[PDB]
């Protein structure tokens with residue numbers, strides 16, 4: 642039993658809710674919140690900008706030190722950093738950004754990072770400003786992640802479409 646509430650169950654291991662991931666993170670304090678990161682960990686907008694704003698920019702400060710030491714992530718890759726006031730840990734995962742021309746096949750590699758964590762609160766990777774079709778992202782999630790994932794979808798309209806079209 643865990644503390645996630647109001648989720649619709651899609652499969653054995655995937656759950657989905659219309660929620661603001663920031664507000665859900667602050668209420669649940671999950672072990673892991675996933676950030677929709679870019680390779681530079683520049684948290685300017687979308688989910689990343691919102692999560693970073695909620696940390697009062699502490700996420701960005703920590704991220705800049707990470708990049709200065711380690712260099713950029715790979716598209717499809719991830720790193721574990723602090724969850725600050727939102728979670729124990731933040732798993733920064735880089736989905737392909739269609740608006741940069743990145744290969745959508747890398748979306749499966751991105752979701753594979755979730756399998757290193759038993760339970761996660763997450764957004765749909767490569768959705769929103771990353772330009773992928775969220776229905777495709779949900780399909781890849783279900784077909785790739787084997788650990789327990791709680792997906793927060795900010796937009797109520799998209800949430801209803803994802804549920805109604807789910808196979």
Ligand SMILES: c1ccc(CNc2ncnc3[nH]ccc23)nc1
Pocket residue numbers: 660661662663687688691764765768769770793794795796799
């Ligand atoms: C429109 C469609 C999809 C998204 C995906 N981005 C997010 N997904 C979950 N929670 C969020 N909070 C802020 C952003 C965010 N954004 C905007």
